[PDB]
């Protein structure tokens, strides 16, 4: 397995950013997941080499951090807050609307690999509950009609 | 440039300090910051001795806005009695349920935080500073990276800052989904490229932190106060709110209020005033049942006249106000808090690892009416026994709020036990 030069160049930039190469590990894994739509297991040995860390170290870091996904490729991750304030203000209404539009539940991917619903803890936007993200974009859920408009922008 | 979409969180201030620009829901770039006299406090600070800056921050009464309220000046004094090099860390991990105070400074007035970091780094003699921002704040990450480049361009960062001989670089690190990485020693482990496993304390980071060197960890909101202390002087700063708990404070208010958002208020403000005077009262004018101080404390409707300060009888914590009204099920709410701690324990300590899991597993059975008598007694026992042998605050408090709901709302819990 080899990193495409465009991705490899970004990874080297992160590794060169901090005073110590190993400090770039999370920025590199974010970059890899951004590129592939998940962390390919095969990607970890080359990354370990670039960070000058043992593979078992890199594997343990991927396992520890909940944003990284080695299982499912998805173009867009719909992160739905399931914590106290979003639960009080209508997490279940948002999940119902997502099921009506996409036909999937939390933990599932659409058949085209486009959308994965990821249940997450408090996203720190609680005044705007119930909260969701679509990759890096973050939104208050108002209604199914409003959610349908937002999702139409992701192609 | 173009940043990811951010919800436009409502922000209101009676003091016009931390939220002078951040009350408007948009990025304020360096030109707007300079127009408002931004970076003049840094110029003033670099003409003072580091020890003088520490004395001003000490005398200001500034206390850790991350939630523990440790005196900031005293934390700096502990660091500087230890040999260098020293590191300065801005904690931007903000992941407590209900807590969104730090992100509005980061995303709207990043230069207020940057100016704070530079003055604080100078005060403790750190030439290397970090911002650790949670993975789920991508917009904040891009905004800070852009803002740091602006500061470099204007000569507020790099070598020999404004001919002072003081050198500083600020590195922006990102989290990747762990609440525990906000714990200052787990944060440092993550900055070292490892799993977010808290360290046995003592030592405190100010003695042994990043690469084992003296390290100050301060919260975004703490650091955002430093420019005001230098600009106004510690005496004028102490005129803001009560003289023992002085300065502006941010209150992230959510749940069943008419005006959920961030309120900049003095800390002599009561919890009742936050809800009814500022946040517009309750949705449908329903009675307050409880306030969750994030995932830390549960206050009943009999405890609304407490001051929002760091006093023993005060609200304390992050200033996070989650409002539940008369129709909200306290056991359902307790279950969401249990689920949070279940999801976030790092598992190093046995009572924390098993206790956070069992507390959530058993409380789910209770909530769904599937609990045996042994499950009920088991739940009570595990709730009281998460803290033993714990080496960080998570284990220490994972049972705290839920225990307060059992003591303050027994009638509601008894309904489930039947
Ligand atoms: N803002 C957020 O999103 C979150 C905030 N929190 C807050 O975290 C708080 C607990 O934090 P901790 O760091 O465990 O509290 P702590 O009270 O043990 O320490 C507070 C600060 O003072 C320093 N300190 C304490 N004793 C010291 C000593 N003897 N010498 C030198 N320095 C000393 C610590 O190093 C730390 O920086 C809770 O009250 C909670 O409100 C928790 C989770 C998330
Ligand atoms: C589990 C846990 C999570 C924490 N998360 C945060 C956080 O997101 N942000 C923060 O500033 N402090 C957090 N803290 C508190 C820090 O350990 C530390 O006390 C604080 O960052 C020091 O800064 P301050 O003195 O300016 O408040 C957390 C503590 C614990 C026990
Ligand atoms: S108390 Fe819990 S979260 Fe803290 S170090 Fe121990 S196991 Fe990890
Ligand atoms: S509880 Fe959902 S954003 Fe905080
Ligand atoms: Na602008
Ligand atoms: Na914001």
Numbering used by the authors:
A (entry chain A): 6 to 160
B (entry chain B): 2 to 419
Task: Quote from the publication.
Complex I couples the transfer of two electrons from NADH to ubiquinone (Q) with the translocation of four protons across the membrane. The L-shaped complex is structured into a peripheral arm that protrudes into the aqueous milieu and catalyzes electron transfer with one FMN and 8–10 iron–sulfur ([Fe–S]) clusters, and a membrane arm embedded in the lipid bilayer that mediates proton translocation. We have determined structures of the electron-input module of complex I from the hyperthermophilic bacterium Aquifex aeolicus, encompassing subunits NuoE and NuoF that contain the FMN cofactor, the [4Fe–4S] cluster N3, and the [2Fe–2S] cluster N1a, respectively, both in the air-oxidized and dithionite-reduced states at resolutions up to 1.8 Å.
To determine the mode of nucleotide binding, crystals of NuoEF were soaked with NAD+, with NADH and with NADH plus dithionite, leading to refined models at 2.0, 1.8, and 1.9 Å resolution, respectively. Besides the atoms of ADP-ribose, all atoms of the nicotinamide ring were also clearly resolved in the structures containing NADH, while in most cases only N1 and C4 of the nicotinamide moiety are unambiguously detectable in the structures containing NAD+, indicating a dangling of the oxidized nicotinamide moiety along this molecule axis in the binding pocket. Remarkably, the reduced nicotinamide group penetrates significantly deeper into the binding pocket than its oxidized form placing it in an optimal position for hydride transfer. The two positions of the nicotinamide in the binding pocket are here called tight (NADH in reduced NuoEF) and loose (NAD+ in oxidized NuoEF). Water molecules that are here resolved for the first time play an important role in substrate binding by forming hydrogen bonds between NADH and NuoF. For example, the nicotinamide N7 is bridged by a water molecule with the side chains of E95F and D103F. In NuoEF, the carbonyl group faces cluster N1a in the reduced state enabling binding of the nicotinamide in the tight position.
